[PDB]
Design a protein around this ligand. Sequence first.
Ligand SMILES: Nc1nc2c(ncn2[C@@H]2O[C@H](COP(=O)(O)OP(=O)(O)OP(=O)(O)O)[C@@H](O)[C@H]2O)c(=O)[nH]1
Ligand SMILES: [Mg+2]
Length: 333
Amino acid sequence: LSPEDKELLEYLQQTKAKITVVGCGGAGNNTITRLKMEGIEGAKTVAINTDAQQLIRTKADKKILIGKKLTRGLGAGGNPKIGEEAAKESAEEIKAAIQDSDMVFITCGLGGGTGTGSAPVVAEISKKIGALTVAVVTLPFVMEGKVRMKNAMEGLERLKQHTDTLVVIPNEKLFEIVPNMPLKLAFKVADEVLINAVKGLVELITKDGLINVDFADVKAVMNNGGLAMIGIGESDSEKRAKEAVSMALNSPLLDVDIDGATGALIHVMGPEDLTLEEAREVVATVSSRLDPNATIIWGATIDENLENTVRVLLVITGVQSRIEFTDTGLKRK
Ligand SMILES: Nc1nc2c(ncn2[C@@H]2O[C@H](COP(=O)(O)OP(=O)(O)OP(=O)(O)O)[C@@H](O)[C@H]2O)c(=O)[nH]1
Ligand SMILES: [Mg+2]
């Protein structure tokens, strides 16, 4: 290289796109494990919990047992305050774990004591170190009781204070996707949605695809994405790309008016025969449903575990004005 170049390269050296995914509580830890085992691209995984037993059986690049002096390696028993105090107690360790991150993904299942309580603390620390802070969390099933939904919503309120974009997935809507779903499989299905949402969002930024997704653009949109929701769809039919995005746009997980949506992140995933043309048809379809001033970031990657099905992950941001926070869950305005 040359004097100018060599300098630049060195510059690229220091700077980067350090992404860290943090899972809190059992649900959060279970998510991290899958990401680690199936190997999420260009992202560090961190699992944190008060329950040492859940944490020891968890797999991640780093593990932080929080609340040692407070919970003595035991869970929070559903007490959000314990999870908060515990996270506060381990603020330094958490900070060390996510230090130097350009972006931090906080994932957990709201409703318990650790995830609900610690998540907002990890988020605050994440912002203090200057990382684009994004959370992907789930709301509990109705069958879990009002108390769980209350703590969840309360935690969703605290969380919204420290995040740049807060993606919320209502588990209850999972029953609308698969009506005859056996109870013993509810959480196995939720696991799948969570993984597809987090991995899908992360790899959209880190995985080489048929088109380049710029990190600066991703910042611009997530920096103030506010409250966000997702849509998932896949098809192998004649118009696979057309059906997939149609499914995603009609997904019950995306329970809200998207016309006022400020932006969107679209991740098209398919087998080796995936073409840029299909990707564009997906974007075009979504583009018409949102405000013409909305910013749309999109990518398209090959997933060899797809055979001949195309998958579409939709993330609609800035929809908090079309939503209201009740202790029974989110309600459409
Ligand atoms: N996807 C997924 N969701 C889960 C699973 N188990 C729990 N949930 C959901 O996640 C919510 C929080 O539960 P946990 O993650 O177990 O709780 P925790 O954060 O560890 O908190 P404490 O046990 O009270 O210390 C529950 O209300 C369920 O909605 C699981 O294995 N997978
Ligand atoms: Mg626990």
